[PDB]
């Protein structure tokens, strides 16, 4: 038993050794018996069961309201996360596991804020959306019943470089030189507060007009920040989906670009939209950085959609990768297809669920195992994708503590990205045992006082040592042979200490503390990897570098986060391997690359799909016999009778059935990410 | 680490004037005094009708911290004609950039607008003023006749400036040519001589300037920041400039030849919008005379634990090499949103250790966001990645982040004490602060105890005033101090000396000083800065045997020394500082005689043996290398015995074997010192007579030089014994091995073809693939998986070409990926279209491949057409085709010529079935 060899000194020290250690506070315990070891072995010494101090960690569910089935109802009833609050109690170095459920409730309210670029290039676009309010309402009516629409516009900071300032007529009509009239330049103007009277959208849009700026890049991000943080002005509903449609056809200014204009004050992320609906700090505050934009988007639960023209889709595709939770769509030069763009983007947003952690204590660590559709379990992954509206997914979370912290109560939140609903975890630590409540300092129970009696042996103060503190510091008589050596022939305290009255006292230490009845244990001599010693993601006790819950290995040099193993298509290691320490290890021949995606010699792509079409056409196949084929048939299936050869990348493939007939089918995928295949109705 | 943070000199400017936006030193060669230059771009001035014209202030040192403006320009806006202003100086941000060199001062106004001489426009060309002693001349290279925004109209020349060694000015305008940016360089002599107040578009003869380029480069902001250094060895400073928006906003840094403005090198960022290039600096950081490039990316986002992106900032350090290539390493920030890397200021040799240093600012870090500055020291191997000091802003925000560290300047010894100093700007609160470098003293301590082995029966000396004889030993300690720069002749040191320092708490100490009776002794020593070591002696004696028990634990003699800085402070109160990387204490050990009994001295006989299971090692792999070492003493006890392991060029230590049962566990250690590297493990202090010890150590070894064929280990045992100090030396050898495991594999798409072919008919002459039949692709991959690479190899492809006088598959066109070149014995596509070879006539293809390393592979792509006419002939003949193809390879030469080569060969088989 590890507990006997390291603790035994006191109740608190015993329980901190390991989760399974137990302490006996019964004074009737036989003299010389081990006072600290696992309960089942301890009880054999007839220690009073009521006097045993063996706390056990637990997770208790406080608020658990069932997941809702429909978004149409009351604000306080809709529930997409369950349980909603959980009480967690942990021992000094123990861990507990709990679960969570997430549902993409159908018919949930939606808020759409249309943030439009109004440079002179978008004059054609402003004409196309003159009836978008009615058309958008009709299309969204089949997805939600509580739609709300708002509008806003931006050009760029109305300052030098960016603005025309000569002739003085150009200030009042930047299009003066083109013999045409356009509005004076503006940074960001809020037009329509999110409202359900969709007719107002048409009225407001019909009154807008474009402006003109000098340089090519625009000031969109500076407007995204204000559309995000000015919640009361914009009118975001907390219990609704927030879509921010950002439309533009040009490059964008970024942080530190404002220095050319004489603007050096960093963006503060506050709301500066005044009573006139104009962003007042436009000319005195720099553009926001991507980090601040991401932080503010996450806090307000806003999904940002980049609806941009093809000449800049690649740029915003790369920007979107640095702002997780955002979508990009190709906008027509006329903005005629923005409605379908919005509708498609909304489907993509609700097809994915990803968890998020807030205010996690530094001493804690979490590991997730996601249970996506069809009971698929992906260890280490905290997100699913490919969902439909109304689907349910579940996760399993395990929390571990890096030793007993000073604070006794702490809390953190687990929340899906873009959701208001969240799980609140209340963490408690019970490092100190109950018997300590009746400590008796300097009592007659302790030799000459000079100590404290608590839960058992007295805690000897200065000038005394040994059981009952009977031996003074000045005695150290050598007549004792009280087992003060790991094994005869080796020094009494392994040269790390000196034996006094039979108990070793460890001498100076380099950069830690020494422990053990032979001073054989310490917390600073652990193993090393490429000269780093313990990796720092874990404990270092008795020479062992012990890692957190999300780190592993004798050296704690191995991660468990799976982001680096995520393929571009969105499934783990391209389905050809497992992540290990953040590096996919391929399990099928020929697969190589960072995510096992480079396989050149893998069989013909249609070969894999033939096994799926077997599942989706006929009652045969091992996967079908397993009933697991629905897991592997992620692709869309459509039946035909003549192969649709009208495709540039459609793979026409065939195979010989177990029956005499021949099977015909095709496959392809497009930029939208959808993967589809056609199957002939009847085999030939 | 030697910057004085306790009493810095603080300067203050007008409220709201951005005083401290740009800082620099002023060292006029004509005068002894030296000043600070501080730019206040928003300061109100006395010019007629000018609002927020900007100012440059000259602040002096060694006196009242008083700042006075420099009168670069006392006039207002000139008039092109009656009531038609030529220029608009209001809000011109004069002083946004300041530089000086000897007696020259150059300050610029990036936001200076002027009305061109051809229209009534208002264009920010930017202007600069150069003060050369008594003469002041305006310098506006971008105020030319190329007026529109497609020319130099919006240049904003002077956004960043610098001086070269040859008295050239480098000026950057990030707005030229639709914000492509521009660099302009002129000779200071030509600027002064060619000046004319009545000419607004002066032309300079020897000007160097970049030129407009394709529209794809618009909005790059070339010239956002500039630096100068030599990067081609001709002794003429070249131009380094940051382009933060280049390459899809990845950021770039251009290096231009300093003599004809031709491009030399380009650096590119790794993350978009990180603003790679916000700041740049060129300085030699490793003392090899080759300038090194530093590039800041304030908004860089890295991934922390759990992979979340956080905006910490990054600085890229590039060490120049004689070969013309740069060895680059990255350095990340420490706090989120602190914008680490905003400013980079070469400090020169801050501590006079022989290598230059550098400071990097995070103007929004620290408590709240008052700002922080990090100081990094340079080593012979490059920059030291751990900051040796941290400066913290002390002024809270008034209405804007203080931005302490947004601008810095160093490498000038303002107080002439021999160490360069530093200025930090805090334009957010309108302040500038000067940090002075403290002199650094290096102290060499000494401590020795001659009678190390104490015989408690060797009563030699007697206690003072008593008849008792005691065994006593001498303790001798010394001090030596030296340092560069202005330092006092004599340094006062206080020394505290402890006997039996391992005793703690109330435990009795076994040794005491003779003249006194305490176990501790303290002395004040006066050290003169010089090479001769100064020493002092004391006599210590063992306590009588009756008073103490422990005879085994060694007696530790401990010395620590302190320097009273208050006494050594110079006339201005600048205190010295001890060197950071030298210990303040030194220790020795004295051992009681553990009954060796031979002749009251101990004769040890140290011997060892070494062995391993890795009889051979491969070039590179998951090295499990290990060593099992035997150590024994066949003589009398050995004091402070320890095992030393020496390793060759490439090697590493993993630790002692922990899991094994019979394997003894030891507290081994690893250090590198005296241009050598070793593992050290204490075998026991002392090792007892006849002691036997067995231990095992884990290593890691990979080879890359190809220069040798085997790896070695040399071992030794050392002790403190009088005579048999060292053990006989032993060596261990392991041979290198080459294992370039390689495999050849292929696939066929489709795996089968079914006839009759839909939508096909026979034709007299085919012209397109569908006239011939369905397409077939055969693919092969040559891959290397083994620990070892190979430099060249060859592969063969055997492919049927005629059976029963029928063509079978028909070659169309090649495709490959890797370092090989191929050839075939028969024509490719002999007809101009836009069941193996053992029974059928064959076509053969040959290809030779170059170097394939571990995990690399080469792929051959062959796409062909199934001549379905021949297969209709087959169907008439009514047989079946399991049409087949095969390939093979052979490795021909390893890059490890020094090692024995072994033949590796294999083959693969592919097929494509054809059935009705």
From Swiss-Prot, chain A:
Effect of residue 540 to R: In GT2; type I
Effect ascribed to mutating residue 302 to N: In GT2; not expressed on the surface and absent inside the transfected cells
Gene3D superfamilies: 4.10.1240.30, Cytochrome c1, transmembrane anchor, C-terminal, Laminin, ligand-binding face of the semaphorins, domain 2, ntegrin, alpha v. Chain A, domain 3, von Willebrand factor, type A domain
Modifications made to the protein after synthesis: Phosphorylated on tyrosine residues in response to thrombin-induced platelet aggregation. Probably involved in outside-in signaling.
Disulfide topology: 3-21, 11-433, 14-36, 24-47, 175-182, 230-271, 372-384, 404-431, 435-455, 446-458, 460-469, 471-501, 484-499, 493-504, 506-519, 521-542, 526-540, 534-545, 547-556, 558-581, 565-579, 573-584, 586-596, 599-602, 606-653, 612-633, 615-629
Tissue: Isoform beta-3A and isoform beta-3C are widely expressed. Isoform beta-3A is specifically expressed in osteoblast cells; isoform beta-3C is specifically expressed in prostate and testis.
Ranges where the record places region CX3CL1-binding: 265-285
Keyword NAD: no
Domain PSI: 2-48
Principal subcellular localisation of the protein: membrane
Effect of residue 31 to P: In alloantigen HPA-1B
Annotated Ca(2+) 1 binding sites: 121, 124-125, 249, 333
GO cellular component terms, semicolon-separated: alpha9-beta1 integrin-ADAM8 complex; alphav-beta3 integrin-HMGB1 complex; alphav-beta3 integrin-IGF-1-IGF1R complex; alphav-beta3 integrin-PKCalpha complex; alphav-beta3 integrin-vitronectin complex; apical plasma membrane; cell surface; cell-cell junction
Bilayer disposition of the protein: Single-pass type I membrane protein
Recorded consequence of changing residue 487 to Q: In alloantigen CA(+)/TU(+)
Keyword Amino-acid biosynthesis assigned: no
InterPro entries: EGF_extracell, I-EGF_1, Integrin_beta_N, Integrin_bsu, Integrin_bsu_cyt_dom, Integrin_bsu_tail, Integrin_bsu_tail_dom_sf, Integrin_bsu_VWA
Region (Involved in CX3CL1-, NRG1-, FGF1- and IGF1-binding): 175-182
Resulting phenotype, residue 117 to Y: In GT2; type B
Biological role: Integrin alpha-V/beta-3 (ITGAV:ITGB3) is a receptor for cytotactin, fibronectin, laminin, matrix metalloproteinase-2, osteopontin, osteomodulin, prothrombin, thrombospondin, vitronectin and von Willebrand factor. Integrin alpha-IIb/beta-3 (ITGA2B:ITGB3) is a receptor for fibronectin, fibrinogen, plasminogen, prothrombin, thrombospondin and vitronectin. Integrins alpha-IIb/beta-3 and alpha-V/beta-3 recognize the sequence R-G-D in a wide array of ligands. Integrin alpha-IIb/beta-3 recognizes the sequence H-H-L-G-G-G-A-K-Q-A-G-D-V in fibrinogen gamma chain. (Microbial infection) Integrin ITGAV:ITGB3 acts as a receptor for Herpes virus 8/HHV-8.
Family: Belongs to the integrin beta chain family.
Other remarks in the entry: The constitutive activation of ITGAV:ITGB3 on neoplastic cells may contribute to tumor growth and metastatic potential.
PANTHER family xref list: INTEGRIN BETA SUBUNIT, INTEGRIN BETA-3
Name of the protein described by the UniProt record: Integrin beta-3
Organism of derivation: Homo sapiens (Human)
From Swiss-Prot, chain B:
Main location: membrane
Single GO cellular component term: membrane
Localization per record: Cell membrane; Cell junction, Focal adhesion
Start-end of each FG-GAP repeat: 2-68, 79-140, 143-195, 207-261, 262-327, 328-385, 389-452
Gene3D superfamilies: Bicelle-embedded integrin alpha(iib) transmembrane segment, Integrin alpha, N-terminal, Integrin domains. Chain A, domain 2, ntegrin, alpha v. Chain A, domain 3, ntegrin, alpha v. Chain A, domain 4
Residues engaged in binding Ca(2+) 4: 413, 415, 417, 419, 421
Top-level taxonomic group: Eukaryota
UniProt membrane topology term: Single-pass type I membrane protein
Glycosylation sites recorded in the entry for this protein: 44, 260, 266, 458, 524, 585, 674, 805, 821, 878, 906, 913
Protein name: Integrin alpha-V
Protein's job: The alpha-V (ITGAV) integrins are receptors for vitronectin, cytotactin, fibronectin, fibrinogen, laminin, matrix metalloproteinase-2, osteopontin, osteomodulin, prothrombin, thrombospondin and vWF. They recognize the sequence R-G-D in a wide array of ligands. ITGAV:ITGB3 binds to fractalkine (CX3CL1) and may act as its coreceptor in CX3CR1-dependent fractalkine signaling. ITGAV:ITGB3 binds to NRG1 (via EGF domain) and this binding is essential for NRG1-ERBB signaling. ITGAV:ITGB3 binds to FGF1 and this binding is essential for FGF1 signaling.
Gene: ITGAV
Disulfide bonds: 59-67, 108-128, 142-155, 461-472, 478-535, 596-602, 668-681, 822-847, 837-842
Amino-acid positions noted as binding Ca(2+) 1 in the UniProt annotation, renumbered to this chain: 230, 232, 234, 236, 238
Recorded family membership: Belongs to the integrin alpha chain family.
Extracellular-facing ranges: 1-916
Keywords: Calcium, Cell adhesion, Cell junction, Cell membrane, Cleavage on pair of basic residues, Disulfide bond, Glycoprotein, Host cell receptor for virus entry, Host-virus interaction, Integrin, Membrane, Metal-binding, Receptor, Repeat, Signal, Transmembrane, Transmembrane helix
Quaternary data: Heterodimer of an alpha and a beta subunit. The alpha subunit is composed of a heavy and a light chain linked by a disulfide bond. Alpha-V (ITGAV) associates with either beta-1 (ITGB1), beta-3 (ITGB3), beta-5 (ITGB5), beta-6 (ITGB6) or beta-8 (ITGB8). Interacts with CIB1. Interacts with RAB25. Integrins ITGAV:ITGB3 and ITGAV:ITGB5 interact with FBLN5 (via N-terminus). ITGAV:ITGB3 and ITGAV:ITGB5 interact with CCN3. ITGAV:ITGB3 interacts with ADGRA2. ITGAV:ITGB3 interacts with FGF2; it is likely that FGF2 can simultaneously bind ITGAV:ITGB3 and FGF receptors. ITGAV:ITGB3 interacts with IL1B. (Microbial infection) Integrin ITGAV:ITGB3 interacts with herpes virus 8/HHV-8 envelope glycoprotein B.
Record-listed Ca(2+) 3 binding positions: 349, 351, 353, 355, 357
